[PDB]
Structure 1
Amino acid sequence: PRRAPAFPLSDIKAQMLFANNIKAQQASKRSFKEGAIETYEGLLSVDPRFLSFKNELSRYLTDHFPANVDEYGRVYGNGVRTNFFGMRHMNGFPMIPATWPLASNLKKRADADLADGPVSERDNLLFRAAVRLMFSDLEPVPLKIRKGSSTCIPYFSNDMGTKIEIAERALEKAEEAGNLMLQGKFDDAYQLHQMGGAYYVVYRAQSTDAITLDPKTGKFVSKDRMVADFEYAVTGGEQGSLFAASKDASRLKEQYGIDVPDGFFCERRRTAMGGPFALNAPIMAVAQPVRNKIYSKYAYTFHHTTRLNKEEKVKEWSLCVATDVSDHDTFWPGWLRDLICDELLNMGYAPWWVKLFETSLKLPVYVGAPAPEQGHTLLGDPSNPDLEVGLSSGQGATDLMGTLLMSITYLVMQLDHTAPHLNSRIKDMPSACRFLDSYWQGHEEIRQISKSDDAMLGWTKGRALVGGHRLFEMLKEGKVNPSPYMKISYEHGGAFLGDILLYDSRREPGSAIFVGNINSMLNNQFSPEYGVQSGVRDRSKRKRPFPGLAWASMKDTYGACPIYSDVLEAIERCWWNAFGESYRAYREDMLKRDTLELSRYVASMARQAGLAELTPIDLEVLADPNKLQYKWTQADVSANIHEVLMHGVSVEKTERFLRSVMPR
């Protein structure tokens, strides 16, 4: 069922992806690299005192604070959902090998008994209504770009000036490029305007992953993570093998002279992709206005900020179902890309823009280095983009693609299993739009709060409530998938966008509260994804610009966890045992240094201004801007702080671009 073409780096098709500059050439050739991360300034993730600390703390906390999750996956009591062994990784050292990304997910979906298109006309109307509501009366805004982000294929530039020039040129030439693609001239569109080529595969660390302590043996067991070899990836699983990657860290002693304590493992590695910036810029210019619409008009379903903001919605429900989606991005259906494109064309969107959008979701992928002596291969032919990878992480609208799929998937689940009496309200496009508009505003007896693959489904009092309880029971049983679209189950320890839903004895949403996840505090403080990058002079370009600032927002973020104080005291005690120093004093010093450094970056901040005008969100984002890519949005951050992390193309250039894309 068609193997994807593959080209080695030596091939002209792969050579054309990398411009004639040092950075692009280094990116093409970059071999497998590993090493301890600089967790904090002057501290390596593999420092013997740090690993001794992690061993003592993970063991103590698991012992004293066992998980309090009921038969229905509801968190109660201590607010703990698993053991604390997830911190036991040699950060910066990955599992070997990392996966080869699947060129086609069609067989994967078919074998999982998932649909190859909308099942019924109702579902087809609902997916199409989502497009009409999301993409209709949009307002132009400046195109914001993350500082220090790469332009990837073909230039691999990290320079803001160059990135602004590339983006402005892309908005000027997107029409000409899209029209070339409509003529099947993909090579011309790429050669002339750098729109096409491929996604560049970067493997990112998932710093904490499941580890269990076997009581029988007293030995730790790391969660097996299945990886596809090259053959499996190019054949969509028809040939080759899917096997467990090796998380064994013993190798670090032999290879690097690093002492590996018992029960410490190599990190899980996830595929991440970087899009060709010239293709992403015209997509982002439409994606940002879409987010502004859904986060304003449909704020109920889509705009999530604080634990109390979430709580106010959930408390009004009679039933709250916390769902889980298995491997969202890899299962994301190409038929949805095609349905979205078809509907945008029906709405009157510029065909050239729709073509650029369609192409961004069929693009080839350049595999860097999954393991030593592996990679440097282009999957798919850039002359005719035809891949079915699912959802590419670096596509300009990935969040919206996952949100569109999932919001409708959950609504369909509620209709099928709980609310057949609402089917008569979805007869045609106008009625599908009116119903969805009402549902997304939280005006129906069936409700939801969602973001991509994370959601909480609600039922108020009414006819659907009884069905709601049967659906929850079906999820608990776990024998039948409630959706024809994706693999849905209930979350083991219900949470929404980082906040755990803490139930009491009643196990009802009315008396349940949202609390910060204490395990996430530990993940962020002791297992960061990236090092401090102390050699990157411009802090705003770092993955962790101001790590010290997270101490100032900690109480606001995690203070509501039942065991907050217990954890901080356990940290203090264990850090004293390991370093002979006060962790609290160490973090207070880092907080002071980073507060002072911050004023250099904020125009409104005087030489020693302090954090007085900054919110807890501002502080969490300055310590971890990745939270701005999965948890929060631009509007949640103070304007003077957003400017530290992002730069924009003028609204004058985007306004002119948007006028040419949009209907009448």
Structure 2
Amino acid sequence: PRRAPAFPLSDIKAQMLFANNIKAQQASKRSFKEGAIETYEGLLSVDPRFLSFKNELSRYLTDHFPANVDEYGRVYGNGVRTNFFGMRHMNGFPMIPATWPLASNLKKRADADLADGPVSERDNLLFRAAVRLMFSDLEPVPLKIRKGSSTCIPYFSNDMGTKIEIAERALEKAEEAGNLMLQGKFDDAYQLHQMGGAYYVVYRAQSTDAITLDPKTGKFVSKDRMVADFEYAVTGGEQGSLFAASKDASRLKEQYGIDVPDGFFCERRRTAMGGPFALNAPIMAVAQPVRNKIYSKYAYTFHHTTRLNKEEKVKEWSLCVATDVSDHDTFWPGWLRDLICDELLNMGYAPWWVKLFETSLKLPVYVGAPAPEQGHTLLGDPSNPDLEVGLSSGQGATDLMGTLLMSITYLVMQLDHTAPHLNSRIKDMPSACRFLDSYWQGHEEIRQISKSDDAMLGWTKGRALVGGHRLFEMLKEGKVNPSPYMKISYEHGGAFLGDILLYDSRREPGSAIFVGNINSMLNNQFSPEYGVQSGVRDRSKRKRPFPGLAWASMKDTYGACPIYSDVLEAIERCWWNAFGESYRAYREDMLKRDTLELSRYVASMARQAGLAELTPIDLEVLADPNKLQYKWTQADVSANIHEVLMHGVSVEKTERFLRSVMPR
């Protein structure tokens, strides 16, 4: 069923992806690299005292605080959903090998018995209504760019001035590039305007992953993570193999002279892709106005801030179903990209813009280094973008693509299994739009709160409620998938956007509360994804600009967890045992140093201003800006703090660009 073409780095097609500069050339050739992360300034993730600490703490917390999750996956009591062994990884050392990204997910979807298009006309109207409501009356805003982010293919620039020039040029030339693509002249669009080429595959660490302690043997077992070899990836699974990657860390002693304590493993590695910036800029210029619309007009379903903001909505429900989606990005359907594009054309969107958007979701992928002596291969031909990878992580609108798919998928699930009496309200496009507009504002007896693959489905009192309970039972039974679109199940320990829904004896949403996940505090404090990057002078460009600041927001973020105090005391006791120092004093010193350093970056902050004007969100984001890419948005952050992390292209340039894209 057609193998994807593959080109080695030596091939002209791969050489054309990398500009004639040191950074781009280094990116093309970069071999497999691994090493201990600098967890905190002067502390490596493999430091013997640190691993001793992690061993004692993970064992103690699991012992004293076993998971309190009922038969229906509802969290109660202590607010704990699993063991605490997830911290037991040699951070910076990945599992081997990482996966080769699947060039086509068509067979993957078909074999999982998932649909190759909307099943019914109702579903087709709902997906199309989502496009109409999300992309209609948009207002232009400046194009915001993350400081220190790469432009990837072909320049690999990290310079803000260069990135602004690239983005401004992209907005000027997007029309000419899109029109070339409409003529099938992809090579010309890429050669002239750097719009096309490929995604650059970077493998990111998932610092904590499931580990269990086998009571029979007293030995730890890491969760097997399936990976595709090159043959499997190019054939979409027709040939080659899907096998468990090796998380065994024994090798670190032999290779690096690192002592590996019992039950410590190599980290899970996830594919992540970096888009060609010239192609992403015109997409981002439309994506941000879309987010502003859905987070304002449809704030009920889409705008999530605090645990109390979520709680106010959920408390009004008679039933709350916390869903789980299996491997969302890889299963994301190309038919949805095509349906979205077709609908945007029907709405009157510039055909050249729609073509750029379509192309961004079919683009080839350049594989770097999944393992030693592997990689440096382009999958797919940039002259005719035709890949079906699912949803590329570095595409300019990935969050919206997952949100569009999932929001409709969950609504269809509620219609099919609980509310057939609402089907008569969805007869054509105008009625589909009116119904969806009402549903997304939380005005119907069936409701939802969602973001990409995370959601909580609700039922108020009414005709759909009884069906809601049967659907929940069907999910518990786990024999039948309730959706034709994606693999849906219930979450084992229901949570929404980091906050655990803590139920009491009644097991009803009315008396349930949202609390911070204590395991996430431990993940963030002891297993960060990145090192401190102490060599990167400009802190605003680091992956973790001000790690010390997270101490100041900790009580606000995690204080509501039933075992908050217990965990902090266990940390103090274990850190004393391992380092002969106070963890609290260590964090207070880091908080002081980072507070002082922060004022250098904030124009409004005097030489020793303090954190007085900053919110807990501001502090969590300054310690981890990745939270601004999956948890929160621009409007949730103070303006003076957003400026530390982002820079923008003027609204004058974007306003002119947006006028040319949008209908009449």
TM-score, normalised via structure 1 length: 1.00
Give CA deviations for 1:259-280 in whole Å, capped at 9, x if unaligned.
0000000000000000000000
* Superposition deviation, residue 21 in structure 1: 0.1
Aligned to 2:575: 575
Give CA deviations for 1:354-378 in whole Å, capped at 9, x if unaligned.
0000000000000000000000000
Aligned to 2:228: 228
Distance in 2 (alpha carbons) for counterparts of 1:290 and 1:246: 41
* Superposition deviation, residue 633 in structure 1: 0.1
Distance in 1 (alpha carbons) for counterparts of 2:600 and 2:550: 18
SS in 2 for 1:271: strand
Give CA deviations for 1:131-189 in whole Å, capped at 9, x if unaligned.
00000000000000000000000000000000000000000000000000000000000
TM-score, normalised via structure 2 length: 1.00
SS in 2 for 1:554: helix
* Superposition deviation, residue 490 in structure 1: 0.0
* Superposition deviation, residue 308 in structure 1: 0.0
* Superposition deviation, residue 655 in structure 1: 0.1
Distance in 1 (alpha carbons) for counterparts of 2:607 and 2:309: 35
* Superposition deviation, residue 52 in structure 1: 0.0
Report matched runs for 1:450-599 at 5 Å: 450-599=450-599
Give CA deviations for 1:578-599 in whole Å, capped at 9, x if unaligned.
0000000000000000000000
Give CA deviations for 1:229-272 in whole Å, capped at 9, x if unaligned.
00000000000000000000000000000000000000000000
* Superposition deviation, residue 450 in structure 1: 0.0
Distance in 1 (alpha carbons) for counterparts of 2:192 and 2:167: 14
Distance in 2 (alpha carbons) for counterparts of 1:597 and 1:257: 36
Distance in 2 (alpha carbons) for counterparts of 1:420 and 1:248: 51
* Superposition deviation, residue 625 in structure 1: 0.0
SS in 1 for 2:217: coil
Distance in 1 (alpha carbons) for counterparts of 2:191 and 2:625: 33
Aligned to 2:43: 43
Give CA deviations for 1:422-468 in whole Å, capped at 9, x if unaligned.
00000000000000000000000000000000000000000000000
* Superposition deviation, residue 654 in structure 1: 0.1
Give CA deviations for 1:576-624 in whole Å, capped at 9, x if unaligned.
0000000000000000000000000000000000000000000000000
Aligned to 1:426: 426
Distance in 2 (alpha carbons) for counterparts of 1:224 and 1:73: 22
Q: How many residues are matched?
A: 664
* Superposition deviation, residue 560 in structure 1: 0.1
Distance in 2 (alpha carbons) for counterparts of 1:25 and 1:257: 31
Distance in 2 (alpha carbons) for counterparts of 1:267 and 1:532: 18
Distance in 1 (alpha carbons) for counterparts of 2:109 and 2:248: 31
Give CA deviations for 1:495-553 in whole Å, capped at 9, x if unaligned.
00000000000000000000000000000000000000000000000000000000000
* Superposition deviation, residue 228 in structure 1: 0.1
SS in 2 for 1:641: helix
SS in 2 for 1:269: strand
Give CA deviations for 1:53-109 in whole Å, capped at 9, x if unaligned.
000000000000000000000000000000000000000000000000000000000
Give CA deviations for 1:40-62 in whole Å, capped at 9, x if unaligned.
00000000000000000000000
Distance in 2 (alpha carbons) for counterparts of 1:254 and 1:471: 52
Distance in 1 (alpha carbons) for counterparts of 2:658 and 2:54: 51
Query: 5+ residue gaps in structure 1?
Result: none
* Superposition deviation, residue 323 in structure 1: 0.0
* Superposition deviation, residue 470 in structure 1: 0.1
* Superposition deviation, residue 110 in structure 1: 0.0
Aligned to 1:400: 400
Distance in 2 (alpha carbons) for counterparts of 1:257 and 1:277: 40
SS in 2 for 1:33: coil
Give CA deviations for 1:197-222 in whole Å, capped at 9, x if unaligned.
00000000000000000000000000
Distance in 2 (alpha carbons) for counterparts of 1:220 and 1:631: 32
* Superposition deviation, residue 341 in structure 1: 0.1
SS in 2 for 1:390: coil
Distance in 1 (alpha carbons) for counterparts of 2:470 and 2:612: 50
Distance in 1 (alpha carbons) for counterparts of 2:411 and 2:2: 34
Give CA deviations for 1:606-647 in whole Å, capped at 9, x if unaligned.
000000000000000000000000000000000000000000
Distance in 1 (alpha carbons) for counterparts of 2:143 and 2:303: 20
**RMSD, matched Cα:** 0.1
SS in 2 for 1:162: helix
* Superposition deviation, residue 419 in structure 1: 0.0
Give CA deviations for 1:396-433 in whole Å, capped at 9, x if unaligned.
00000000000000000000000000000000000000
Distance in 2 (alpha carbons) for counterparts of 1:601 and 1:95: 37
Distance in 2 (alpha carbons) for counterparts of 1:52 and 1:191: 54
* Superposition deviation, residue 286 in structure 1: 0.1
Give CA deviations for 1:329-368 in whole Å, capped at 9, x if unaligned.
0000000000000000000000000000000000000000
Distance in 1 (alpha carbons) for counterparts of 2:441 and 2:276: 35
Distance in 2 (alpha carbons) for counterparts of 1:36 and 1:218: 27
SS in 1 for 2:373: coil
Distance in 2 (alpha carbons) for counterparts of 1:64 and 1:570: 10
Give CA deviations for 1:474-512 in whole Å, capped at 9, x if unaligned.
000000000000000000000000000000000000000
SS in 2 for 1:393: coil
Distance in 2 (alpha carbons) for counterparts of 1:401 and 1:640: 29
* Superposition deviation, residue 129 in structure 1: 0.0
* Superposition deviation, residue 288 in structure 1: 0.1
Give CA deviations for 1:294-320 in whole Å, capped at 9, x if unaligned.
000000000000000000000000000
Distance in 2 (alpha carbons) for counterparts of 1:153 and 1:603: 33
Distance in 2 (alpha carbons) for counterparts of 1:288 and 1:226: 35
Aligned to 1:627: 627
SS in 2 for 1:355: helix
Distance in 1 (alpha carbons) for counterparts of 2:655 and 2:595: 37
SS in 2 for 1:167: helix
SS in 2 for 1:285: helix
Distance in 1 (alpha carbons) for counterparts of 2:548 and 2:217: 40
Aligned to 2:34: 34
SS in 2 for 1:612: coil
